Ligand binder design. Structure first.
Ligand SMILES: *[C@@H]1O[C@H](CO)[C@@H](O[C@@H]2O[C@H](CO)[C@@H](O[C@@H]3O[C@H](CO[C@H]4O[C@H](CO)[C@@H](O)[C@H](O)[C@@H]4O)[C@@H](O)[C@H](O)[C@@H]3O)[C@H](O)[C@H]2NC(C)=O)[C@H](O)[C@H]1NC(C)=O
Ligand SMILES: *[C@@H]1O[C@H](CO)[C@@H](O[C@@H]2O[C@H](CO)[C@@H](O[C@@H]3O[C@H](CO[C@H]4O[C@H](CO)[C@@H](O)[C@H](O)[C@@H]4O)[C@@H](O)[C@H](O)[C@@H]3O)[C@H](O)[C@H]2NC(C)=O)[C@H](O)[C@H]1NC(C)=O
Ligand SMILES: *[C@@H]1O[C@H](CO)[C@@H](O[C@@H]2O[C@H](CO)[C@@H](O)[C@H](O)[C@H]2NC(C)=O)[C@H](O)[C@H]1NC(C)=O
Ligand SMILES: *[C@@H]1O[C@H](CO)[C@@H](O)[C@H](O)[C@H]1NC(C)=O
Ligand SMILES: *[C@@H]1O[C@H](CO)[C@@H](O)[C@H](O)[C@H]1NC(C)=O
Ligand SMILES: *[C@@H]1O[C@H](CO)[C@@H](O)[C@H](O)[C@H]1NC(C)=O
Ligand SMILES: *[C@@H]1O[C@H](CO)[C@@H](O)[C@H](O)[C@H]1NC(C)=O
Ligand SMILES: *[C@@H]1O[C@H](CO)[C@@H](O)[C@H](O)[C@H]1NC(C)=O
Lengths: 510, 107, 124, 114, 210, 104, 208, 112, 120
């Protein structure tokens, strides 16, 4: 009942195929016309596919002879006529160059379709008379169109429309929303500058998905009439900020301040990206704010001061704050918070305390302090912090004190010290049994602690160092757990030690 | 056409400025007012397909002629305005370039 | 002003020869093409010949090519059409026409009065 | 090739009339430069139009010319009663073995004076 | 979904009002509008009105002062050597007055030579030349004047040579407007300009105060 | 500000940024035979109000557009050579190569 | 501040360029390459593209170059290349075979190849009339240069009039600029008095 | 008025020196056209600069004129031993009854 | 292009003298003409000027009236007749070609100069 003609390329509809065939795929062909006489011979057809063609003529009675036709795919034809479709559930009209004005004459009566796809066409206006006599639609696909205007009653002929894709359009201003049955809306890649909804609706809306990304929205739109929304992408717009939302993407905007009242009604969010903005002040002074935020991204902003409240932002897991311009912070800025897991402070010049203090959090797992210009490291920087991932890379002139890593022996897994330029390391590497990967590229290190006992190290980086002699009496540890070894860039003498050449055969790499 | 109609395209709109009334100024003596005008009308970025209708290339024509990523309705031809005003007790004639908008284009 | 006078027309036996002359005043032959046109009595105009400003290259009708010759004397400021071996259908009023330019284009601006050339073997 | 031209036309005074000359084998282009001449019976022909559109000096603005379809058309708008004459079209082509002008049988355009 | 079709005219109107107010105060390099207390409330003098009427008529970001310099009287002995003939007219400018007009050659931005053409019957081609020290002339420009029954102002772009006059120039340097004498036939200037009002020089320059 | 200032030196406001368009790789075309590609460039960056602060503001007019973006000022043409059927055609498209930007 | 993304602006510019190329050519679909010749470009088309690329509305204008009539032709016997002027005549029939209707012409460019100049030369362009008269067209002050340069003259109205009201042969005279003081001579050298041509951009007849 | 220069000066070869010319009464402008002449003793003076900027034909590009403050300045960059000569300033002003030129006491520039 | 001057010599106090200046290589009709004097061992002193025609003259204040400058363009000659010459007028006199038809553009070329010595 299935005949595949995707590889086969022909010029007309075949007539030698068995009639009982239910699924026909005539993609990749060069048909130019459809006639009723060859098409009605396959009455038992259930699915028909004819995409990537050049069909320019459609007989009105060609599709009428197939009562069991379904999944109609008229994609990619020179259609720039059709009769009623009694039992077709799926329609696809992608790449057929439908302009605003052909759909009224082409579409007759069809109250039994589920999916209609008018994608990749040249539709300019969605007139009220474009959609009619089709109250069964549930999937409307209108992306890659050239729509600028939609009338107030254009979608009134679709009482059960739930998913609507209007991506890659030119829809500009939108001032009224009156689609109660809509569930999914995709207004991405448009020129929308304003998004206003109805005021005091009779019934609450049912929208649960909304893209407003890649637009020109100057303000955060008023979505108080959309209580069922769970995902909201507002990225790549120009929001300058003057109940059941979960995902919010406010990236690539001109957000300079966060209003307190805007934080009053913002609750139950789980995911949040607010990266690559120009924020000034971010203080969570209100009690009970941000109850269940599982992620919060504040990277690539210009925050100079932040004052997070006590026992307010406690459920956060992943935090990024790279690129900010912080000057002075209290040492207990992060101590009052409950269960931070991953903290990023790259390019913020945050000075650890001796015990901003980081040892006050017993739930922290990853911390990065790249390019913080730390001249000298405190001994009690991580005395009580069970950190597993540490990144103090790109810190020239850094001096490592004795016992700088206090209680990281049984917790630290990966450590990165790239570009630090350490002349000597005071950290006893072998006793870190839980360490797995190490980065020491671009440094002035000439000697390393003696590995008396084997460790669980897997990645060791030694770029641009001054290691000339590496005897096996000290470095010879962890010879069985080593998987990747790197030795380029070191001025190693020819056959100066002999252990590296012996271990290069097994348990080491180039 | 679009000089006295609210149609949605990048057009110049006539706007007369009266320094005595519109701005309440008492230091400019001549001219008492001028046609400043303003560009108005959204220039939507018309997304492109390899195959498209022939009646939509006009939407390219007066919606994205320069093929910019973020087009604006910006003036194309401007006309300078001369003014006369007094500095201290000395009169002065100055010529301010690019004041009178007479054509707007999407760009 | 602008004047072309023509001479040489008359009555001859068939197969004879004439030397039609066209003297001009008011313009220069050095700048303009010169054309000969004919009009049979009772019928329409018929282009006969043309010659450019120097006289080295000439254009003819193929009812007349070889049988007719055209020449210029820029020094004498005159134009000649020498007709040899006239058939019966060669009787016509011949017109000397100035051209608009050095080409065979820009039309024939000013026309002469024309000379009525008659060919007939019949006696008086 | 011969230049076909329609034999005779009648136009009321003040009316608009069109005279067309064409090739029997080919189409009249501007490269087949049409020259429109007017002849009063008994008088020398006068150039009206040259280079398909251009009016000779002294020729009234009511005479115009164009390439209509595959023929050359001379249009007289508001035909004055002194426009009754023989109208000839001379087309520049390549006849036989050389270039040359060819006249068509001109129209005996008669204005219905009475 | 309903695309808006009503554009609020008053909001954009006030937005452009504020924008042009800022623009006027920005090109004039003024933080605040000036005070009329130290201004005699006089109908503006004839010279300033002549300036404004000349710069209104036609043929960097900031505002630029406009000053006219009248071409030196034909009765002066400068024009005794260069007599107004039937093929050329001469327009000499006292460059000192150009320098009290524009104090610094760097400040000059645009200079136009202004003539007042009377009624003209036939189209006239004119050439404008600049006087050198050694009685030679460099070609500057060509203008084709179509005939007209009304007097009209004519502008010649002479910004570069006027800047050269301000920097390196002499005192009484000027221009010559001649007829286009081709290589085949001689021509004459049937063009009649007033007083050989008289031609002048309009200078748009950045003031030294701003 | 033309291409000479920004092709070698970075600058905070908007100007011409490099963009070489290849008809095979960047666009996907076998019908444009010549050129293989061209430097279209683009205008990118901000333009503050002049009172909030140059060659960018030569044709500036805050009272014309609601918000001053910046648009190309000099737009050099592009000639292309392409086959229609079997006949080659050389065609000139105007305003195809961005050369200088200006705030407006 | 910095709040724009490079990649999105770049890709939007790419798609806008695609739309612009398809729309300026009035192309609904990209041309199919089924009927292309199986070889490289001909020499005439390559030379035309080179001349279009050389340094001297909205939709695409078809470009066609028409070389001037060769200096050995009879037409130059009357107009000899004197010391003070050179003559460049064009067969307007070729121009009409290039541009079929006068209204379609968008810009016409007289192109010259000046060889070398030790001193700056002021030159002037005239067009020819039927009555051996010359009307002034333009004036250029050629600065000295040690390399051959391609000179451009905007003759759009002249060539449009030639397409409408022009004869078979119509041309220009490039003469050294004369003043009312004395006479001058043409010291610039152009090839063949290759030879100068006319670059015409006109709307194609199919898209007219 | 009286045109004032410094009586004399000295410059090392290859350096940059500035000879300066002023009025006792008021300022100099370009309207008070400074002409700069050089005179080797026993020889007629030679024009170097005119109209505050322009060099005479044959004058090397070392000499450059300008208006510095209230006075007119001739700057020589990269001096050479043949530049040791008397430098004179001619200012064009309204001198008394008529308007004309006036000279100043020239500087005997001696290259070290 | 050169200038030759003559007439210098010994003059009694309160005397009379007529300097002469003749040039070649250019035209007197095109340029103004200047007289400069230089005391022996002291600085230059601009004496006088005359424009292209010769009808209007310019003089220094210390010697106006006592000096009469004149031209004659037919034979390209130039004169400075010094009447009521005093004891302080001894100097080398240079006849100079100016740069234009006015006192601007500088004395473009200078002559060798003639010594005028006044003494008893
Ligand atoms: C200006 O260019 C014109 C063409 O661009 C030139 O016209 C050409 O003139 C020559 C002779 O002077 C002709 O050569 C002759 O060709 C005929 C056959 O011609 C027929 O076929 C062509 C092409 O289909 C058609 O256009 C003609 O009307 C004829 O129907 C043969 O018998 C000989 O080979 C003879 O050489 C050209 O055919 C003709 N080309 C045309 C009319 O397109 C014109 O001469 C040029 N002007 C100057 C002053 O040089
Ligand atoms: C070109 O314009 C110039 C200014 O626009 C003209 O200069 C004018 O020349 C006349 C001479 O006929 C002066 O009239 C005299 O002025 C003095 C005052 O001069 C003051 O300035 C000089 C410095 O230049 C200074 O040395 C004096 O002490 C003065 O302080 C009066 O005292 C006389 O009585 C007589 O009126 C003009 O003053 C002068 N203009 C200016 C603004 O100074 C120049 O003549 C013009 N060119 C031509 C060829 O005419
Ligand atoms: C709405 O349509 C757009 C069409 O662009 C969809 O976006 C594309 O989705 C496919 C598969 O999900 C990706 O391969 C493409 O890369 C996407 N393109 C762009 C430009 O985003 C979008 O997913 C659709 N939305 C819904 C809800 O179906
Ligand atoms: C939101 O849109 C941006 C594009 O602007 C995209 O990068 C991001 O992945 C989207 N958010 C989610 C959750 O996919
Ligand atoms: C936005 O957040 C979601 C949360 O899962 C993540 O998948 C996505 O990659 C983020 N996008 C950007 C652009 O940060
Ligand atoms: C005159 O001087 C100018 C200075 O620019 C020079 O170019 C020109 O050749 C000179 N002419 C004569 C005849 O000396
Ligand atoms: C066009 O120029 C190229 C060099 O860029 C050259 O290789 C080619 O031969 C030229 N074409 C012709 C027809 O001369
Ligand atoms: C030549 O013809 C043109 C046609 O425009 C005319 O303007 C000009 O005056 C004529 N010249 C002569 C000398 O007849």
């Amino acid at each position: 009942k299935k005949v595949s003609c995707q590889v086969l390329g022909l010029l007309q509809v075949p007539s030698v195929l068995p009639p009982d065939t239910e699924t026909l795929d005539l993609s990749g062909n060069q048909l130019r016309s459809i006639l009723a006489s060859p098409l009605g011979f396959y009455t038992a057809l259930r699915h028909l596919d004819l995409s990537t063609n050049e069909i320019s003529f459609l007989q009105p009675g060609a599709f009428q002879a197939l009562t069991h036709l379904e999944h109609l795919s008229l994609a990619h034809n020179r259609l720039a006529g059709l009769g009623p479709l009694p039992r077709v559930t799926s329609l696809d009209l992608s790449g057929n160059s439908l302009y605003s004005g052909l759909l009224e004459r082409l579409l007759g009566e069809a109250p039994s379709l589920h999916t209609l796809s008018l994608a990749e066409n040249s539709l300019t206006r969605l007139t009220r008379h474009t959609f009619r006599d089709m109250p069964a639609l549930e999937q409307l696909d209108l992306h890659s169109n050239v729509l600028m205007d939609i009338e107030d009653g254009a979608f009134e002929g679709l009482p059960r429309l739930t998913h609507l894709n209007l991506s890659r359009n030119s829809l500009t201003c939108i001032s009224d929303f009156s689609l109660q049955q809509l569930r999914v809306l995709d207004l991405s890649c448009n020129s929308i500058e304003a998004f206003q909804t109805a005021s005091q609706p009779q019934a609450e809306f049912q929208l649960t998905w909304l893209d407003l990304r890649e637009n020109k929205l100057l303000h955060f739109p008023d979505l108080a009439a959309l209580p069922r929304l769970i995902y909201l992408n507002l990225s790549n717009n120009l929001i300058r900020l003057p109940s059941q939302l979960l995902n919010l993407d406010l990236s690539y905007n001109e957000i300079e301040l966060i209003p307190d009242s805007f934080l009053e009604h913002l609750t139950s969010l789980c995911f949040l990206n607010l990266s690559r903005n120009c924020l000034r002040t971010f203080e969570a002074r209100r009690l009970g704010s941000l109850p269940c935020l599982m992620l919060l991204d504040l990277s690539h902003n210009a925050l100079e001061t932040l004052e997070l409240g006590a026992r307010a932002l406690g459920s956060l897991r992943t935090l990024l704050l790279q690129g900010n311009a912080l000057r002075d912070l209290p040492p207990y800025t992060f101590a009052n918070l409950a269960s931070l897991q991953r903290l990023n402070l790259q390019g913020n010049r945050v000075s650890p305390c001796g015990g901003v203090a980081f040892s006050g959090i017993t739930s922290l797992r990853s911390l990065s302090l790249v390019d913080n210009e730390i001249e000298l490291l405190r001994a009690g920087a991580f005395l009580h912090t069970p950190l597993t991932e540490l990144d103090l890379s790109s810190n020239p002139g850094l001096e490592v004190a004795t016992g700088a890593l206090g209680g990281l022996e049984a917790s630290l897994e990966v450590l990165a010290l790239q570009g630090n330029g350490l002349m000597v390391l005071q950290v006893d590497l072998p006793c870190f049994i839980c360490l797995k990967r190490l980065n020491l590229a671009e440094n002035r290190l000439s000697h390393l602690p003696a590995w008396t006992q084997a460790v669980s190290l897997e990645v060791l980086d030694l770029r641009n160092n001054s290691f000339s002699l590496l005897p096996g009496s000290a470095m010879g540890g962890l010879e069985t757990s080593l998987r990747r070894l790197y030795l380029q860039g070191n001025p190693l003498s020819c056959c100066g030690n002999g252990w590296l050449a012996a271990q290069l055969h097994q348990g080491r790499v180039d | 056409y679009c000089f006295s109609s609210t149609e949605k395209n990048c057009c110049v709109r006539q706007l007369y400025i009266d320094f005595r009334k519109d701005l309440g100024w008492k230091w400019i003596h001549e001219p008492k007012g001028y046609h400043a005008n303003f560009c108005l009308g959204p220039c939507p970025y018309i997304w492109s397909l390899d195959t498209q209708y022939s009646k939509v290339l006009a939407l390219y024509n007066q919606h994205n002629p320069g093929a910019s990523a973020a087009p604006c309705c910006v003036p194309q031809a401007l006309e300078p305005l001369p003014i006369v005003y007094y500095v201290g007790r000395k009169p002065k004639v100055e010529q301010l370039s690019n004041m009178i908008v007479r054509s707007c284009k999407c760009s | 002003e602008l004047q072309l006078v023509e001479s040489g027309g008359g009555l001859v036996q068939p197969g004879g020869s004439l030397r039609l002359s066209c003297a001009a005043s008011g313009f220069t032959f050095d700048d303009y093409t010169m054309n000969w046109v004919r009009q049979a009595p009772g019928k329409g105009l018929e282009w006969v010949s043309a010659i450019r400003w120097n006289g080295v290259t000439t254009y003819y009708a193929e009812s007349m090519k070889g049988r007719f010759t055209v020449s210029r004397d820029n020094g004498q400021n005159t134009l000649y059409l020498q007709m040899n071996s006239l058939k019966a259908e060669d009787t016509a009023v011949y017109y000397c026409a100035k051209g608009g330019s050095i080409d065979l284009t820009y039309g024939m601006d000013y026309w002469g009065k024309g000379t009525l050339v008659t060919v007939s073997s019949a006696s008086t | 090739a011969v230049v076909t031209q329609e034999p005779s036309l009648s136009v009321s005074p003040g009316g608009t009339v069109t005279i067309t000359c064409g090739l029997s084998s080919g189409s009249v282009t501007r490269n087949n430069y049409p020259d429109w001449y007017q002849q009063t019976p008994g008088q020398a022909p006068r150039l009206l139009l040259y280079n398909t559109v251009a009016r000779h000096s002294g020729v009234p603005s009511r005479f115009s010319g164009s390439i209509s379809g595959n023929k050359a058309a001379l249009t007289i708008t508001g035909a004055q009663p002194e426009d009754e004459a023989g109208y000839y079209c001379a087309l520049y082509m390549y006849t036989g073995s050389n270039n040359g002008r060819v006249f068509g049988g001109g129209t005996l355009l008669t204005v219905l004076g009475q």
